[PDB]
C-alpha cells in the first residue's frame, strides 16, 4: 500500500544543477530496488558498502536520493576518493560511503538544437567541499590580488559555468542524469525495507 516514491525521483521532468544538487528523503515505505537494478534505462549502477542484488533483503532507517545532471565523463567523479571540478567543487562522497550511484544518458531530454545551457556547475572555489556539502553561493571569485568588490573583471570571475549540451556532442560531453542513493543506518527502528 505504501511504496517508496523512487518513480518520482527517476521520472522527474527536470533535474537540479550539480552545484545546487537536489536531496529527497525516503522513509517509512516498501522499496523495490530490483525494478531499478534490472532497468534497461541505466548505464551506471555502482554501489559501495552494499551489494545491489541484496538491497530487496535489507532495511535502512532512511534513504537519501541526491539528483543532478553532469556530463558523461564526470560520472566517474561521483564515487568515494575522486578529484576534479565535480568531486572537489560541486558534489563530494565520503570515503566511508554506503550507497549506489545510478546514471543514464539524458541527451534526448537535456540537449536541443542550438545547444541546451540550463545546467550549471561550480568552476572556481577556494577550498574543496566536505562530503555532502552544498555550495549555492554566487560570490565573485578572486583569482588575483586586486579587490573584485562584487564585480567581474581582471582575475575576478563569476564562479558558475553552464554545460553546453548539443545533441551531436561526444558521449563524454552528453548530459547524464545521476541519482545517488545513501542507505542510512541510525541507532533507531528501520523504516525503509525491501519487499
Amino acid at each position: 500500500t505504501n511504496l517508496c516514491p523512487f518513480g518520482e525521483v527517476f521520472n522527474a521532468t527536470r533535474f537540479a544543477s550539480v552545484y545546487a544538487w537536489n536531496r529527497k528523503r525516503i522513509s517509512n515505505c516498501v522499496a523495490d530496488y530490483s525494478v531499478l537494478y534490472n532497468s534497461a534505462s541505466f548505464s551506471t549502477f555502482k554501489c559501495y558498502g552494499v551489494s545491489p542484488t541484496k538491497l530487496n533483503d535489507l532495511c535502512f532507517t532512511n534513504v537519501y536520493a541526491d539528483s543532478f545532471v553532469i556530463r558523461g565523463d564526470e560520472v566517474r567523479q561521483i564515487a568515494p576518493g575522486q578529484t576534479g571540478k565535480i568531486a572537489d567543487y560541486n558534489y563530494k562522497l565520503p570515503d566511508d560511503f554506503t550507497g549506489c550511484v545510478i546514471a543514464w544518458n539524458s541527451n534526448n531530454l537535456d540537449s536541443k538544437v542550438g545547444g541546451n545551457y540550463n545546467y550549471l556547475y561550480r568552476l572556481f572555489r577556494k577550498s574543496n567541499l566536505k562530503p555532502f556539502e552544498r555550495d549555492i553561493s554566487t560570490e565573485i571569485y578572486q583569482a588575483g590580488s586586486t579587490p573584485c568588490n562584487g564585480v567581474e573583471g581582471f582575475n575576478c570571475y563569476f564562479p558558475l559555468q553552464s554545460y553546453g549540451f548539443q545533441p551531436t556532442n561526444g558521449v563524454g560531453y552528453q548530459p547524464y542524469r545521476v541519482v545517488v542513493l545513501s542507505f542510512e543506518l541510525l541507532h533507531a527502528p528501520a523504516t525503509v525495507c525491501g519487499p
Epitope: 551506471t44 549502477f45 551489494s51 578529484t83 560531453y173
Partner: antibody
Framework: QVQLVQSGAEVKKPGASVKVSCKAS????????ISWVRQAPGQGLEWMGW????????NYAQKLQGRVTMTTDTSTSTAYMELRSLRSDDTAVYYC?????????????????????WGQGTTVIVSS | SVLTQPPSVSGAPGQRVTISCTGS?????????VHWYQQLPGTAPKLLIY???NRPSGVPDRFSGSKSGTSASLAITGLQAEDEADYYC?????????????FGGGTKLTVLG
C-alpha cells in the same frame, strides 16, 4: 587461470566482414568490460572500442565510423568484435583486453583503467 | 597516434633511460591517468605501470612512471637485457568529438649488448 582466448587467424577480401571472438575464464566475466585494441604489422597499438559486459553498452573509436559492432554472450562469457567493409589498413593483430575495473553493480565508463588481462591476439589479413 | 613518444632509445646494461610521452589539453592535460605497456616481440602488451605511478605485482621497482602537465615519463634504472621491448604510453581523450582510449606510437628500447 584468469585468461582471454581469441578465435583463430582470418583472411578476408576487401569489402567483406570479420567477427572475432574473445572467451573469458578464471574470473566473473560480467564484473568487467572488454576493450578491443588492434596493431597493424610493425605499427603501434590502436583502440577500437569497449563494451560493458552486464548491459552491453558500447563506445567505438570515431575512426571506425559505424563499421564496428561489439557484443557479449553472458551465458558463454564471450565478447565479439565484428568489423564490416574491410580495407587494406584493417590488416592487423586484433586484441581483446580487460580494463582492470570492477564495482558492486555495473558501470559503462571503463576507459580510464589500465588493461591487465590480454587475449593472445587474432591475425586478420585483408587480401583478394 | 594521439600521444607522442621517441621511436627508439638505447642504454648499456646497468644504466638509466627515460621514455617521454607528450599529450595535450584533452587527455593528460585534462587530468586523465597515463598507463604504460611492455610488448616483447610476438606477445600481447603487458601492463607495466597503471595510474601514472603504480606497478602491478610482477613489475620490479626499476620501472617508475611520472605525469606532469600534458606529459608523462617512464624511467628504467639498472637496464637488463630482458627490458628490451616496445613500450607504449596510454591515456584517455575527452572532447566534443568523442571519448577515446589513446596510445603513444611506441618506443623500441635496445639494451646495448
Amino acid at each position: 587461470q584468469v585468461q582471454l582466448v581469441q578465435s583463430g587467424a582470418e583472411v578476408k577480401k576487401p569489402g567483406a566482414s570479420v567477427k572475432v571472438s574473445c572467451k573469458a575464464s578464471g574470473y566473473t566475466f560480467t564484473n568487467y568490460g572488454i576493450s578491443w585494441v588492434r596493431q597493424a604489422p610493425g605499427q603501434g597499438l590502436e583502440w577500437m572500442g569497449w563494451i560493458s559486459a552486464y548491459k552491453g553498452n558500447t563506445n567505438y573509436a570515431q575512426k571506425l565510423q559505424g563499421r564496428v559492432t561489439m557484443t557479449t554472450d553472458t551465458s558463454t562469457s564471450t565478447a565479439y568484435m565484428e568489423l564490416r567493409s574491410l580495407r587494406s589498413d584493417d590488416t592487423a593483430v586484433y586484441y581483446c583486453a580487460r580494463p582492470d575495473y570492477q564495482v558492486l553493480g555495473y558501470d559503462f565508463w571503463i576507459g580510464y583503467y589500465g588493461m591487465d588481462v590480454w587475449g593472445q591476439g587474432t591475425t586478420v589479413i585483408v587480401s583478394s | 597516434s594521439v600521444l607522442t613518444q621517441p621511436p627508439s632509445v638505447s642504454g648499456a646494461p646497468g644504466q638509466r633511460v627515460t621514455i617521454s610521452c607528450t599529450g595535450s589539453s584533452s587527455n593528460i592535460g585534462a587530468g586523465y591517468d597515463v598507463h604504460w605497456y611492455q610488448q616483447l616481440p610476438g606477445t600481447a602488451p603487458k601492463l607495466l605501470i597503471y595510474g601514472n605511478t603504480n606497478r602491478p605485482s610482477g613489475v620490479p621497482d626499476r620501472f617508475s612512471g611520472s605525469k606532469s602537465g600534458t606529459s608523462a615519463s617512464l624511467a628504467i634504472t639498472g637496464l637488463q637485457a630482458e627490458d628490451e621491448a616496445d613500450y607504449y604510453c596510454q591515456s584517455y581523450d575527452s572532447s566534443l568529438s568523442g571519448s577515446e582510449v589513446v596510445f603513444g606510437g611506441g618506443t623500441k628500447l635496445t639494451v646495448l649488448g
